[PDB]
Structure 1
C-alpha cells in the first residue's frame, strides 16, 4: 500500500558515522562513495547547526554515479523536522505566474517556523447522552462518559449540543472533545457495546477504552514555512491556493511584513526559525534569468541551503549562446562549492546489486551475480538493476525458485542495453527517421 519498491527505496540515511565523520563503507544503503559522502556529512552537520546562510553546494558528477542517492540519504537523515524540498528544475517554467516568482516561492517553502502551544482534550467512552429536545430545542443535556479510571457527568451548552447532534455521538463512541474549539473526532467504537450497533458493516473495527485520566493537556508542535504564511495572507480564504496552485504574483510588501513579524516573534520568544534544505535537481535546466536571481536570493538571513546536481560538461547556458562548465555561468560558479563524484569499482557494483537484490527479495546464485556484475561493468547500474526485476519474473515464468544464468541471459537477450540500442540505430539508418528519409524495404 503506497510503498511500492522504487529506485531509491533501499536508502535509509546517509550511512556515515556521526562522531568522527568516517564514511563506513556499507551502512544504511549508501555503499562505496567515500569522499562525496564525507563532504555531504559536513554539509549535513552544518545544516542542523543553523548558524550559516543559504549557501550552495553543487553535486557534480557523471550519470548514474549516485547523486540523487546522496540527496535522498540527506533527506532520510533529517526526519520530519527540518524541511527538505525537492525541486526538479522544470516546475519553475509555469504559466499561472512568472518564473522568478515561482523560484522565490520555492525559496520561501524551506524556512520553517516552529511554534509549540497547548490544547486541552478529553478521551473516553460515552456511557450515555440525554438531550432535552422536548416543541423544544437544543437547550440542555447531560453527558455521562468514562475512561478505564475516571467517570464523569457534564452539562452542555447550546453550541455543544449543536455539535453533539452534528457528529451524532452514540452511547459507546470513543470521542475527543477538543475543549477550546468544540470539534469531535470519534477515534473509534468501544468493543463492549458491540451488540448496540446495528447500522454498521459486518466487518467493523472496535477499540478499547482509553487508559489514564480524562482531561489532559497536549503540547503539539507545529512547523509551517514562510510560503505558507504568504499564501494564507493573500486572499480572503487563500490557503486553498497552496493546495490548488491558483496563487498568482504575491505582492512583495506582504513578504516584507511577514519577514518583519517572524523576527518580532523570534525576539519575543514566541517562535523559532528552522532553516531547511532546497534540492534543485538538474540545475542545468535553468536559464541565466534564474541564476541572476539565485545569486541574490542566497544573500539574505532567511535563505535555505541549496543543494544541486549537474550532469553536463562544457555545455551551453539556456537563454544565451555561450558555453560554460556544468551548464552554469561563472559568476554563479563563484558562489557554489562543488563536490565531484567518481565511477564505481566492480566490487562496489556487485554489492550495490546485492543491496538492490535484497531490497526486492529476489534470490540469486553467485554465478548469476557474477554475470550481472559483468553486465553492469559494461552497461551501467540502471540496466542491471532492471535486469534483476526482469530476471525474477522470468524465473517465475517456468516455476523456479532462484534466478540463474539461464534467466539473466534471457533478460539480456530481450531488453537491450543502450549501447546496443545506439548500435541498432547506427546499423538501421535508412528506415529509422533520422531527419528526412523513410525507406520501406
Structure 2
C-alpha cells in the first residue's frame, strides 16, 4: 500500500502484560528494554485513566536505545481512543507564529472533545427517479428505493430534487442520504443494473444492494481537539487554516472563552473531555524561553501528558551559554520524571535484527544472522539493520533466494559504518575541507 516498510513498522504495541504491567521478554515487536517498557506502561495506564493532568516524562538514553520505539509503542497501544500528537522540537520555530504560540497549539491539539450525535440515514438502490423539470425546474418528482428487504417510493421536495440532479442520481445507483443535511453520497453502482451504465468504463466496480431497512439512526462519535475549536473561531473559515496552516497567533481571549464553554458542555453532559499525549521528540532542540512556557502550561487543567526524548548528555542549553543534564534547565527537569533506556546485549540485537528481517521480506541464513549480530555489536544496531536491506538487494542481483554471508560481506565492504567513516575522515583530513576552510586539491 501507501505505507512502505519503515524503521518502526514492526512496532505493534508496547509488548506488556495488560493484567500486571509485567513486560514480556519479547512481544508485539519490542525486545528487552523491560524496565523502560514497564515505566512507559505505567504512563500509558494513567494516560488512559485521564484523572492526572500535565505530568511530563523524559525518556533518556544513548542513540538507538529504543526511545522512539517505546514512544511509537505507546502510540500503537493507545490507538484512536486518545489524541496523540508527535512534535519534533524543530517544528515550533515557525515564521508564521512565535514559538510559544506554536507550543500552545501543540498542547491544544492534545485534548479531545468527544461529542456523540445521531442522524437518520436513508440508504438503498435507486429503482427509479422521476423528475418533471417542467422553463424552470425541480417542480415535482418521485424516488423509488429498495434494499434486499424493502422497497419504498417518496415524493421529493424541490430542494431534494436539486440535490438529486446535482448528484446525477440514476436508476441502479446505491446512495446514502443524510436527511437533515440532504447530502447524497453515491456508494456505488448496483451489479444488476451494470448494463445501463453504458458511459462507465470497464474499470468500473459494482456492488450488491444494501441490506435491511431503508432508514435507520446511525450514531457518530466525533472527537475534536481544543485547537480545532480555537482555529474554527478565529475567522469566517477558520477550519480552512487547520489544513493550509496560516493561523496567526490565536487571541488568548478566544481560547479562554472556549475553555469555559467546554467546561459547560462537560457539566451539561453534552460532551466529554479526552486528555491525550504530546510527545516532544529530541526536546533539547527547544530553547530556554520554550521551557519557561512549558513549566506553567503543564499546570493548566487542560494539559495533556507530555512525553520527551533526549540523546544529550550534560550539554549547552539553547538560547543561553551554560550547560545542564540532557541540555534541559534544572528548573524544568524538576518537573519531570526520567525513564532510562540502556544499550542492547548481543542476543537482543539478534532478536531485533530477526524482527527487522521479518518486517522486510528477507530470508537470513543462520550464519548471515550471526554475522549481522556481530556487526551489530561492533558497528551499531542501526547500521546492521541497514545491511539487511542491502544484502537482500545483493542476493537478488546474484538471484539467490536466501541472503548468505557473501551478501552481508559485500554490504559491509560497500557501505561504511560510522566509525570507519570517521576513520576515513581522520585519514583524509587534507582532502576533506577542515574547520579552517583549508583544503588541498593536488594529488
The TM-score range, normalised by the shorter chain, is over 0.9
Q: Which residue of 1 aligns with 2:125?
A: 125
Partners of 2:83 and 2:292 in 1: CA distance? 25
**Kindly tell me: are residues 171 and 432 of structure 1, through their superposed partners in 2, closer, same or farther at Cα, counting changes over 3 Å?**
same
Partners of 1:96 and 1:438 in 2: CA distance? 39
Residues 372-391 of structure 1: CA distance to partner in whole angstroms, max 9, x if unpaired?
Answer: 10000011111000000000
Q: Which residue of 2 aligns with 1:382?
A: 382
Q: Which residue of 2 aligns with 1:136?
A: 136
Quick check: 1:97–1:248 contact (8 Å CA) kept in 2?
A: yes
Quick check: 1:431–1:438 contact (8 Å CA) kept in 2?
A: no
Residues 45-89 of structure 1: CA distance to partner in whole angstroms, max 9, x if unpaired?
Answer: 011001101110000000000000000000000111100000000
Partners of 1:339 and 1:102 in 2: CA distance? 26
Q: CA deviation at 1:33?
A: 1.0
Q: Which residue of 1 aligns with 2:17?
A: 17
Partners of 1:440 and 1:117 in 2: CA distance? 72
Residues 312-361 of structure 1: CA distance to partner in whole angstroms, max 9, x if unpaired?
Answer: 10100011101000000001010000011110000000010000001112
Q: CA deviation at 1:133?
A: 1.4
**Kindly tell me: are residues 437 and 310 of structure 1, through their superposed partners in 2, closer, same or farther at Cα, counting changes over 3 Å?**
closer
Q: Provide structure 1 residue ranges, at least 5 long, that are not aligned to the other structure.
A: none
Residues 240-298 of structure 1: CA distance to partner in whole angstroms, max 9, x if unpaired?
Answer: 01111100011100000000000000001101000000000000001100000000000
Secondary structure of residue in 1 paired with 2:350 = helix
Q: CA deviation at 1:97?
A: 1.1
Secondary structure of residue in 2 paired with 1:240 = helix
Residues 183-223 of structure 1: CA distance to partner in whole angstroms, max 9, x if unpaired?
Answer: 00000000001111111111210000001011100111000
Partners of 2:350 and 2:168 in 1: CA distance? 60
Q: CA deviation at 1:136?
A: 4.8
Secondary structure of residue in 1 paired with 2:420 = helix
Q: Which residue of 2 aligns with 1:428?
A: 428
Quick check: 1:124–1:209 contact (8 Å CA) kept in 2?
A: yes
Q: Which residue of 1 aligns with 2:325?
A: 325
Q: Provide structure 2 residue ranges, at least 5 long, that are not aligned to the other structure.
A: none
Q: Which residue of 1 aligns with 2:230?
A: 230
Moved over 6 A (4+): none
Residues 16-67 of structure 1: CA distance to partner in whole angstroms, max 9, x if unpaired?
Answer: 0011111001100001111000001101001100110111000000000000
Q: CA deviation at 1:177?
A: 1.1
Quick check: 1:431–1:437 contact (8 Å CA) kept in 2?
A: no
Q: CA deviation at 1:438?
A: 4.6
Alignment RMSD, CA only?
0.8
Q: CA deviation at 1:433?
A: 0.2
Secondary structure of residue in 2 paired with 1:363 = coil
**Kindly tell me: are residues 136 and 323 of structure 1, through their superposed partners in 2, closer, same or farther at Cα, counting changes over 3 Å?**
closer
TM-score (norm 2): 0.98
In the TM superposition, what are the counterparts of 1:238-387 in structure 2 within 5 Å?
238-387=238-387
**Kindly tell me: are residues 136 and 424 of structure 1, through their superposed partners in 2, closer, same or farther at Cα, counting changes over 3 Å?**
closer
Residues 73-130 of structure 1: CA distance to partner in whole angstroms, max 9, x if unpaired?
Answer: 0000011110000000011001111111110000000000001010110111000011
Quick check: 1:57–1:306 contact (8 Å CA) kept in 2?
A: yes
Quick check: 1:430–1:437 contact (8 Å CA) kept in 2?
A: no
TM-score (norm 1): 0.99
How many residues get paired? 441
**Kindly tell me: are residues 198 and 337 of structure 1, through their superposed partners in 2, closer, same or farther at Cα, counting changes over 3 Å?**
same
Secondary structure of residue in 2 paired with 1:85 = strand
1:48 pairs with 2:48 = yes
Partners of 2:228 and 2:439 in 1: CA distance? 58
Of 128-137 and 207-216, the range deviating more from structure 2 = 128-137
Partners of 2:439 and 2:336 in 1: CA distance? 50
Secondary structure of residue in 2 paired with 1:195 = helix
Q: CA deviation at 1:145?
A: 1.0
Partners of 1:363 and 1:69 in 2: CA distance? 24
